[PDB]
Structures are given as C-alpha cells and as structure tokens.
Design a protein around this nucleic acid. Structure first.
Ligand SMILES: [Mg+2]
Ligand SMILES: [Zn+2]
Lengths: 225, 104, 136, 468, 52
RNA sequence: GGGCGUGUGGCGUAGUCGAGCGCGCUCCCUUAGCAUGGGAGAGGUCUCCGGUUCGAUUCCGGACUCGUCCGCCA
RNA sequence: UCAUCUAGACAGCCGGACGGUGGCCAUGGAAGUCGGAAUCCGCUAAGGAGUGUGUAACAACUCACCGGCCGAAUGAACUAG
C-alpha cells in the first residue's frame, strides 16, 4: 500500500512524518485519521512516537533517520530528547548534530545501507553520520538539486527521484546507490517527492491527491507487493 | 404496456439514487446478457430532461426510436405526439392561405 | 496569509509595510520583491498594511527577469530583519528582508532557498520547509 | 430510508456467485444490495454502516468497516443485530470490497467475515457457500500482507485443523471454480473498475491482479482435489479457452513477473495432469502465447525479467518432450524466437539460468533442435567470455560461474570433436587466469572443483613460477 | 426517503402553509387575512411554493 | 454620465417584407516593349438575439458596438 | 340592496347525490368536466345534459341539491364614522 493520508489538509506526509523500518515519528498536532493510518498499517510491532523537533511540527525535514540511529538538530530541547530516548527502543542511537545546515531531513537522503548528502556538509557531520548510522556516505546532487532529502525518496528496495532529472544522472546515482531509481511525481505532480511521501520496506504513505499511475510507480519501485 | 414496464424499471433504478453512468453501464451489461427490457432501450439517455428512448418494431425487423418522458404515462406521450401532429396541420393550412397572395 | 495556512500563527512584530523591497531568496530568477499588499490585513485610516515573517503578500518583481517583471504574484516572507519576540522570550532578527514566490495555494514557484528561514514560516508553509536549507 | 426497486434484476434470475437468492458479483454496477432488504435490517446502526460502505470515498468506507468490526467484536450484546438479512447484505457488499484498491479495506473485510463465521458458527451454514469461496480467494491473493493474515485467521477459525482447511477446498470446489469462471470470462477490465475514475491503465492493472489471484486459486484447487478435472471438465474448458488467462503472459509491460509466473505454473500443472495434452486447442493457444513472450524480453527490460527466465526455459523443456518437440512445430518462427531469446538472455545471467538452458538442450538433442557446432557452441563461448569480464564483480557470481562450468562440461562431453575440447581447455584457463580472486573465494573454488586432469594443472602452476 | 406518512406529518408543519404577499409571513393554509399589523391585515395571500 | 443616431461579402457600398455591383485577387487567354486588356471566379451567418409574419436587411423590442452632442466647483 | 328563516336557516359531523344518455357536432380519443352549440324529461325528499380533482378515453373521488343530529338567525355584494 501507498496509503492516502493528509496532515489536516496537507498532502505532504514526509514533512510531518519520518518512517523507518524500526520506528515511526509523527507530529503532535495531528488528526485522528492521520494517526489511524500509521496505527492500522504499522501495527503494534513498530513503535509510533508523537514528537516535536526544535519546537516545530515539521519533523521529517528536521531529522534524518535510520534503523540503527536517529539524527536530531542542535535546537532540539532536552525534554524532547529525553522523551525520544524513553519512547524509542534501546537499539537506535539518538545524537544531536551541531552543523550549520541544521535541517537534516532536507540535507540527508539515507537508507539502511547507503546515503546521499548535501555536498557542502561539514566533515565532522559526515563522520558523525557514518558513525551513528553505520552508513557509507556520498556527497552528490540530483541533477543540480542540492536538497537530496527533499528531492529523493529512498528505501532498500528502490528509489524515486526528481522528475526533471538527467538520465545519465539516473544510471550514475543507481550504480552509486546499488538500487534501481525511477523519475516520477507525487501528489498530483508535485516535484518534491521526499517531502511528498515516506516509505520503508513494507509501507508507503502519501498524500490523497497522489494519482493512481503515481501510486503504481511507487509500489513498483518500492516492491511493496 | 411494455413501455410502462420499461418506465417502471428505469424509474425504480432512478429511485435508488443511482449514478446515471452506472445505470447506463447496467443497461449495457443486461443487453449483453439478453434482457428484453434492457434491449428495448437506446443507450444515449436523456435523464437530464427526464426522457428515455425506446425501440419499437415498425411491423408487428425494422425498429423506430421514440422518446418517452418518464413523468407522463405512455398514453400521455402518445397524446403529445398527436398534439405535435395537430399543430403541424394548422401551420400547413396557414401556408395554403398564404400561397396565392404570396406568389402573386 | 489566509487560505493556504497550515495552522495559526502568533503575532510577530510587523516589519515590512507596503512599498518595502525585500530580497528574493529562491532560484526563480527574480532579484527583489516589492510588497504592494498583505493578505489578511485589517483596515484603519492612514495605517499602512504591514507584513511580518511567515505572511503571504502580493508583490511585483522590480528587478529580475522580464517574464517575471510587470505583474503581480503572491509571495511568502521568510526573513524579517526587524526584531520580534517568541513565547520563549528571545528577541531575534535576521540581517535582511527576504521572501519567495508562490501561487495562492502556497507552493513555491522556485525549487531551492538560499540562506536561513524562520521556523514560524517553515511550520506555517510546508513547501517552504520542504525547499528550505536551514530552519532557525 | 432506502428507496427504489431492482426491477431489472428480477428478470435476469442469475445469482452470479450467490446461491441464496441474492446476486453477488464483482462488477460495480450490479449486485448492490436491494433497497428493500436494506430496510429490513435489525438496527438503525447497521443501516447507516451500509450506506457508508456504499459511498465511494475510502475514508468513509474504512470508518464504516471499523465500526462494523467493533459491533462484531461485542458479539454477545449484538447477536440479535446479525441476522440472515445482515448476512445476505454483507455477502453482496463483501464481494465488491475484496476487489478494492485499498489494502486496508480488503483486509478488514476478510477479518470481519471470519469473525462472523466463528461467532455465528452453524448458523452461517446457509451462507457458507457464498462466503467461503471469497474468503479463499483472499487467502490466495498475490500480496503477502493480505494473504498471510487471512489464512492464519481461517486456520484459527477452524480450530487449527489442517484437515478442515483441505476439506473446504474439496467441499466447495464447484463453487470455487464458478468464482474463477466469473473473473476470467464474465468480467472485463471495464466491468471491474469504473472508467470515469480510472485510466485505461490501472483498470488493466487491477483486472490483472484479480485474475492472477483466480489463477493461483485454480492451481491450488487442482493440487488439493485429484478428481477436479473429470468432474468439472466443461467448466474448466471455458475458463481455459478464454484468452484472458493467456493475456497475462506479456512481459513487454507490467509491474511484476509474479503474475506471469503464476500462469507458467498453471501451464505446468495442467501438463502434469495431462489436461493440456488431452485438450489440444488449449495447449496450442498456451504454447503460442509462451513463444510470443520470448520475443518480448528485450535488452531494455532484461534486468526486470531476469528472475522469471529460468522458469520459462524449464517449462519449455517439459513441453518439448510432449509430442517429440511438437511445441516448436506449432509456430513456424519458433526456432527464430528461441534463438533471439537466447541471445538476449545470455547477456544477463541469473541463478539457475544455465541449468535451464542445459535442460532445454537435453530435450532438444534427440530431435536436433539446435546445431551443436554451428549454433550452440557460439552461444556457450560467448557466454563464458561475458561471465569473465564482469567477474567476479557481482555477489553470487561464484555460483553462476560454477553452474556454467558444470553445464558446459556436460555439453562438451557429447561432442567427440577437437574444437570443443580445445575450447573447453582454453576457456577454462582464461576463466581461471584473468579471473578475479577465484582461489580466494573458497566456496567458489570448491564449487568449481576441477576442469581437467590433476597432473596437468600442476604443470601449468609450474609454468607460472617458470615465467619471466 | 423518510416514509410517506411521516413526510405528510412533517409537511403539515413545514410546507402546507400560506404566505402573505405583502410581508412574507407564514400563515395558516385556510387563512383569509394576515395576522400581522405591518401589512394591515391584508387579504393578499398565496400558497407556499412546493417542490416537484 | 446621459442624449441622439449608426452597423452589408476579403474591401467599399445599394437595398420599398419577396442581398446586388465595383474593387482586391481565383484562374485562363491577350501583347515588339515604356503590360495592359477581355472572359468566366469565390465571397455575406445583413452587428447580434428574440418576437410578428408566410418570410423580415427590409417591421419591431432588447443587447452590443462606433460616431456625435451636452454636461462639476470655487 | 338582494336572498334564506321554528314548515328547521348558516358552521360542523353522517348518508344519498340517480336513470333516459356514451344527449347533438367535432376528435386518434374525449362518456358532466379539450372545445362549439343547445341545456330537456323521468324518479323524486333530492341530484347540473355538471363544481372541481380526475384517466388515452373510462373507472374513481368530491361538489350544489336533499335528507338525520343541532334549534335560531345567517350568507353575498356595497356604503361611510
Ligand atoms: Mg490619509
Ligand atoms: Zn402580512
């Protein structure tokens, strides 16, 4: 399933949510339908944490997540950090990042094995990503889009990239990430695919205005069947 | 009477508040499955003006297409067709009164 | 703001009246935006309609590309440079006035934002938070 | 509250899936619950749940299902609510719901029906004939998430008795077949999904997913019931004759080869049963379509279609055995298609591909389908060369190379010619020498145990030390 | 659909009235003059406009 | 703003209730040039929309459009 | 100014509200009720060649007329303080 969901009318689910294999994060100011989608589809096996990052309802663009670790900005308060430490399982590691770009979901596009980052990140932050997430890192842009997290949706099975992407960039990124990539649109043609939707190994959640060919492209590239 | 049966059928489908295109698809499927009441109907339905159209045999294999209002009886639709006949005759008489002075 | 607001906004000290020229932060090829109107502003005799951070305004491109000049379009203020107070009581300000171009529904005409944006704007507009590099 | 009469339905007198006097059908236009029955429901709450299920929007449908489930969960208080009237209405709606695009709708509907059976056991007997086939179709749905929970629940409903589950397949087999016929023959893509709200594609995609489930069910039915072919021959023929099952065998377009694979399994099962041999026309139609599929595989889609290729070749080998390679004879250009298929297939190798190729050779050699020297060898040689250059760069390469060697070695044995022997030695040396790290992968070296006499290999080691 | 008898009972209070042409007052169906002072108890009344 | 009139072919313009000519150019022929002329061409929703009539450019009503004329203060 | 009125008036209930005759023209039909004319008898306590609803035309319902209950004034149109 690519599950049709709105955040109070918003068809961008990746902005307000962060979904990994092991956990899920949702914003505190959410509707009953928005919570019920993650509660029904994810089930009781996977914890869902209602969280606020840096005083903001936006959490997907603020944080970058992995099954092994979670990265939070510097502006995240101690109460939010302690609540995430209690609510999250003991396996994941939560570490604050002290870096100027500070919006880790926009900066970092990552999965379990390999990650794409903004080219201009600091070397200490790159080593921190490689340490906490245990993930090999490449500094690359998707056809000149420096915000790889906003302009790519990535999982273990496959990836969706920006629609206006050069084909040569598509095989280059596909060989670099060792996963097949498809250029496509989400939410009735919105270009920002990573902000448009969240995905993991068995679930994808998207906006209600995402059309049927777009949803078919999603389930084909992410192998959710 | 068979026109009244067709009208009762279409009105029963209308009174279920069913979508008009789904009603037309139901007519097509029952025509494919050989329902006589469905096969008497012509598919471009004018439900916006509450009007259907029905095929009647000219000889008791050629068929004619006649429009029937759903809000009037079949006999009342026949009287309307008779009325359009009667109005046409009076215009023809007016033309016959016109002809001599007009052509002069 | 008005239609495309995702939630409400606390009152930010108004810093951009009508006639203000702010930098154009996105990559749409426009250089500055000239504010002619503020969405949702009230009516008072002689009072100029002023804008704050996170507000949607009506603006014209005074300097930039000729297909963007000489027409009115909606814009969103992302940097204010007039100091305002949050409910945790820090007084903060950027060093320039800056906004981005959008449609009336709020999605950006451009694709990337240079420089910081305010969290009071990023929370209120998700597309701005999507294309934003750093949110403070 | 509910108004109108289904007058058109009365004339038809076809109950489709239903055997209790209510038409149950997959198509959106018909099989909708009759207004009069809907009014007859015991409580107002139930009636509202039914209106919501009728509405198109999913959030509304889901909310209604959630409510219905809650009512069923509190069975003791609500037992009066669920009556024959409820069951007749549910049966009509359930059919439409199981074909729903949204998985949650599908899963919830299945869960609800199972709960009803457990709670109302022995009173749903009248309705078991309607409900059981549909429940099973869900348990044989390609998506794992819908199928696995549904099966687990069904087993639990029957007190975890394997025999009962098997019995169900036997008892309602005629009905199960009727469901398959209805999806395959009676339905069309348009009938299943509304045109206004769907594109030409998607409608096709949906039909294909549903039909695939039907085929999987058919395969299961055949395995479970030994005598199914004899008792239901007429029904089986109509389902098989229709091209809809066969249209699934297209690799040019489509998200997955999983559906295509299911069709291949059906053809194989039918051959094992002997139904395909028994009925020539069905077999010929299937065979020709399979040959066409071989052409569809192309360089652009080779990566996508690679897992299915070993299976395709294996089926072909089995079919060839029938009628002394009669399958090739059916199509004039079949040999050309095979040659083309082989050329495209060799470029990308998948695990088990080589064994399939050898199996095809083994079946074909008696009837001389491929020239051993002019045609086959070139295929083999090119293959090793390709394998070496991209070697051992991929993971399972060790297994793939091992396979090539085992297979090629067998092929070579049936030559009695110098060129083949020469090729084997030269290629082996090249494969080991350019290599990569063949020795280093112990498993690779073990799997590729040897290619020549032991003493000579030692002499070559001697040359390497002796070399400049 | 409500019910035929229940539609009759609800329409007895909602639809089977008369309307004064001068002051738009909702009046009894068998009334002869408007009960309001502002129109001067006029006898210009019309039936309330039904559907269908 | 109002009043008063107005509206025809690609262009110009004639019409009593029973759409025509010229020009432009469609073609062909004509010719010592300082290249003409002849014969057949097409062409309108009569500004538009209603009503009367049997039919309205032709009568009338409405709308549209253009041209005119007359108009604020200290 | 017209009418009705203890020989039973006007409101309210209840019952009948009929035959010649589907009166004559005209219509594919129109039988009281699309129209054109005439508009008369019988039985009556009383019932129109019809007041509406009403159907293709019927059928059906209701009327204005007469009757039981009521027992005494009432209805229409108009004028002006
Ligand atoms: Mg002023
Ligand atoms: Zn009044």
């Amino acid at each position: 399933m690519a599950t049709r969901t709105q955040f109070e009318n918003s068809n961008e689910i990746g902005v307000f949510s962060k979904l990994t294999n092991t956990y899920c994060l949702v914003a505190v100011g959410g509707s009953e339908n928005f919570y019920s989608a993650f509660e029904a589809e994810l089930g009781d096996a996977i914890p869902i944490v209602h969280t606020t990052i840096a005083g903001t309802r936006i959490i997907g663009r603020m944080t970058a997540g992995n099954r092994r670790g979670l990265l939070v900005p510097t502006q995240t308060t101690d109460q939010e950090l302690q609540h995430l430490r209690n609510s999250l399982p003991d396996s994941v590691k939560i570490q604050r990042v002290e870096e100027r770009l500070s919006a880790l979901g926009n900066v970092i596009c990552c999965n379990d094995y390999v990650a794409l980052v903004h080219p201009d990140i600091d070397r200490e932050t790159e080593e921190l990503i490689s340490d906490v997430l245990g993930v090999e890192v490449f500094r690359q842009t998707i056809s000149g889009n420096i915000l790889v997290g906003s302009y790519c949706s990535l999982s273990n099975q496959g990836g969706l990239v920006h629609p206006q992407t050069s084909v040569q960039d598509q095989e280059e990124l596909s060989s670099l990430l060792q996963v097949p990539l498809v250029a496509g649109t989400v939410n009735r043609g919105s270009s920002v695919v990573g902000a448009g939707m969240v995905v993991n190994d068995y679930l994808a959640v998207t906006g209600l205005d995402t059309t049927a060919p777009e949803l078919s492209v999603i389930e084909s590239i992410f192998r959710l069947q | 009477p068979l026109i009244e049966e067709v009208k009762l059928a279409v009105q029963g489908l209308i009174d279920q508040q069913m979508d008009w295109n789904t009603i037309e698809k139901l007519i097509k499927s029952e025509q494919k499955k050989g329902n006589r009441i469905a096969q008497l109907l012509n598919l471009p339905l004018n439900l916006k003006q509450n009007k259907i159209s029905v095929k009647l045999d000219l000889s008791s294999n050629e068929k004619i297409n006649v429009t029937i209002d759903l809000g009037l009886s079949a006999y009342a639709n026949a009287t309307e067709y008779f009325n359009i006949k009667k109005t046409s005759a009076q215009k023809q008489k007016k033309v016959e009164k016109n002809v001599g002075k007009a052509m002069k | 703001s008005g239609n495309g607001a995702q939630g409400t906004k606390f009152r930010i000290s108004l810093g951009l009246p009508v006639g203000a020229i702010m930098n154009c932060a996105d990559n749409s090829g426009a250089r500055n935006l000239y504010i002619i109107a503020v969405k949702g502003s009230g009516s008072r005799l002689n009072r100029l309609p002023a804008a704050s951070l996170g507000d949607m305004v009506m603006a014209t491109v005074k300097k930039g590309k000729p297909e963007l000049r000489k027409k009115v379009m909606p814009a969103i203020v992302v940097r204010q440079a007039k100091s305002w107070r949050r409910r945790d009581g820090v007084f903060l300000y950027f060093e320039d006035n800056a906004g981005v171009i959008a449609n009336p529904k709020g999605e950006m005409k451009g694709s990337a934002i240079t420089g910081p944006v305010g969290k009071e704007c990023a929370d209120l507009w998700p597309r701005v938070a999507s294309n934003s590099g750093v949110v403070v | 509250s509910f108004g109108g009469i289904n007058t058109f339905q009365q004339y038809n007198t076809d109950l489709g899936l239903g055997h209790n006097g209510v038409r149950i059908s997959l198509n959106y236009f018909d099989g909708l619950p009759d207004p009069s029955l809907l009014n007859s429901l015991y409580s107002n709450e139930l009636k509202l749940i039914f209106k919501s299920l009728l509405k198109r929007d999913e959030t509304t449908k889901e909310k209604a299902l959630m409510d219905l489930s809650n009512l069923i969960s509190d069975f003791n208080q609500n037992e009066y609510f669920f009556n024959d009237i409820f069951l007749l209405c549910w049966s009509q709606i359930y059919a439409k719901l199981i074909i729903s695009d949204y998985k949650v709708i599908r899963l919830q509907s299945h869960q609800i029906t199972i709960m009803l059976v457990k709670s109302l056991r022995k009173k749903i007997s009248k309705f078991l004939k309607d409900f059981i086939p549909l429940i099973l179709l869900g348990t044989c749905e390609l998506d794992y998430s819908v199928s696995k929970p549904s099966l687990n629940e069904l087993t639990e409903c029957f007190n975890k008795d394997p025999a009962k589950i098997n019995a169900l397949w036997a008892v309602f087999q005629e009905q199960l077949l009727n469901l398959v016929k209805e999806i395959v023959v009676n339905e069309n893509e348009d009938t299943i999904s509304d045109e206004r709200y769907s594109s030409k594609e998607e409608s096709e995609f949906r039909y294909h997913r549903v039909i695939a489930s039907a085929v999987l069910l058919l395969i299961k039915l055949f395995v479970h019931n030994k005598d199914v072919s004899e008792r239901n021959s007429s029904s089986l023929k109509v389902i098989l004759s229709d091209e809809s099952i066969w249209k699934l065998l297209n690799l040019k377009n489509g998200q997955n080869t999983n559906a295509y694979e299911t069709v291949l399994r059906l053809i194989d099962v039918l051959y094992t049963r002997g139904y395909m041999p028994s009925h020539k026309n069905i077999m010929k139609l299937a065979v020709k379509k399979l040959l066409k599929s071989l052409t569809h595989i192309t360089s652009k889609n080779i990566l996508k279609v690679c897992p299915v290729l070993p299976s395709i070749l294996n089926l072909l080998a089995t079919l060839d055995d029938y009628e002394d390679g009669t399958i090739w004879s059916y199509d004039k250009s079949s040999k050309e298609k095979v040659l083309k298929f082989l050329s495209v297939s060799r470029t990308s190798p998948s695990p088990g591909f080589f064994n399939a190729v050898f199996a095809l050779y083994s079946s074909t050699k008696r009837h001389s389908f491929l020239d051993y020297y002019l045609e086959w060898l070139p295929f083999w040689q090119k293959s090793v060369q390709r394998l070496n250059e991209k070697g051992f760069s991929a993971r399972n390469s060790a297994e793939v190379l091992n396979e090539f060697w085992t297979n090629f070695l067998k092929f070579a044995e049936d030559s009695s010619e110098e060129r083949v022997k020469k090729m084997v030695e030269s290629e082996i040396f090249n494969s080991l020498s350019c290599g990569k790290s063949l020795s280093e992968y112990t498993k690779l070296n073990q799997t590729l145990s040897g290619v020549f006499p032991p003493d000579k290999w030692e002499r070559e080691i001697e040359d390497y030390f002796t070399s400049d | 659909i409500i019910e035929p008898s229940l539609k009759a009972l609800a329409s007895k209070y909602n639809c089977d009235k008369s309307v004064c042409r001068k002051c738009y007052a909702r009046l009894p169906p068998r009334a002869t003059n408007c009960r309001k002072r502002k129109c001067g108890h006029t006898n210009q009344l019309r039936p309330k406009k039904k559907l269908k």
